[PDB]
Design a protein around this ligand. Structure first.
Ligand SMILES: [Ca+2]
Length: 223
């Protein structure tokens, strides 16, 4: 997260870190046994780390649980990042409490102008590299479909929305991928892609979660 703020420990209780020896992507806990992340975060050997603030210090609220199964969206295209969503089932159920909690799925899509909270352990510089140990946050609005398409000609599908600031300076970044965009208490987006980070006229691009709720629910019901 570029241009954000320190969230505060365990204030984003649905935020997870995906670990394969190291933090490599975010995710969102959607019930005691399932995480939503970005398909471009897929790899084998995932440990899901819940209840994290400092990802380099054991602070006392962590739950570390191996993935038992990963399910990349059937229609994920890694070239276009269309359908950039995956589900991860945990080998055991998380213990849910105030610091480790699921985030509600949307019943309806969000609209341009709604403010949302984007979070993660990704890069904090736009012309630099610095990776934080503690969770970072950014409040940002959803942008219009037309401004999104104008920023990224020929690239925005019906499964993508933009959020952030066209002026630059405030965005998600490398290492935030797979993490949440939460708007009025609902998971509306997944950190997906963008040209650089926090560049002028290059807002963040997010997977549009509301398009996937039917797939999420049926997948959970049969797995
Ligand atoms: Ca920790």
């Amino acid at each position: 997260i570029v241009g954000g703020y320190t969230c505060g420990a365990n204030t984003v209780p649905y935020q997870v870190s995906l670990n394969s020896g190291y933090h490599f992507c975010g995710g969102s806990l959607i019930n005691s046994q399932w995480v939503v992340s970005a398909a471009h975060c897929y790899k084998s050997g995932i440990q899901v780390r819940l209840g994290e603030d400092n990802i380099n210090v054991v602070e006392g609220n962590e739950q570390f649980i191996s993935a038992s199964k990963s399910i990349v969206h059937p229609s994920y295209n890694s070239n276009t990042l269309n359908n950039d969503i995956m589900l991860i089932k945990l080998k055991s159920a998380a213990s849910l409490n105030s610091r480790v909690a699921s985030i509600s799925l949307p019943t309806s899509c969000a609209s341009a102008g709604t403010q949302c909270l984007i979070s993660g352990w990704g890069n904090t510089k736009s012309s630099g590299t610095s990776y934080p140990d503690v969770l970072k946050c950014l409040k940002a609005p959803i942008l219009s479909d037309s401004s999104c398409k104008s920023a990224y000609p020929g690239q925005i599908t019906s499964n993508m929305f933009c959020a952030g600031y066209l002026e630059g300076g405030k965005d998600s970044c490398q290492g935030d991928s797979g993490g949440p965009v939460v708007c009025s208490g609902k998971l509306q987006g997944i950190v997906s892609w963008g040209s650089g980070c926090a560049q002028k006229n290059k807002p963040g691009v997010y997977t549009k979660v509301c398009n996937y709720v039917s797939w999420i629910k049926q997948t959970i019901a049969s797995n």
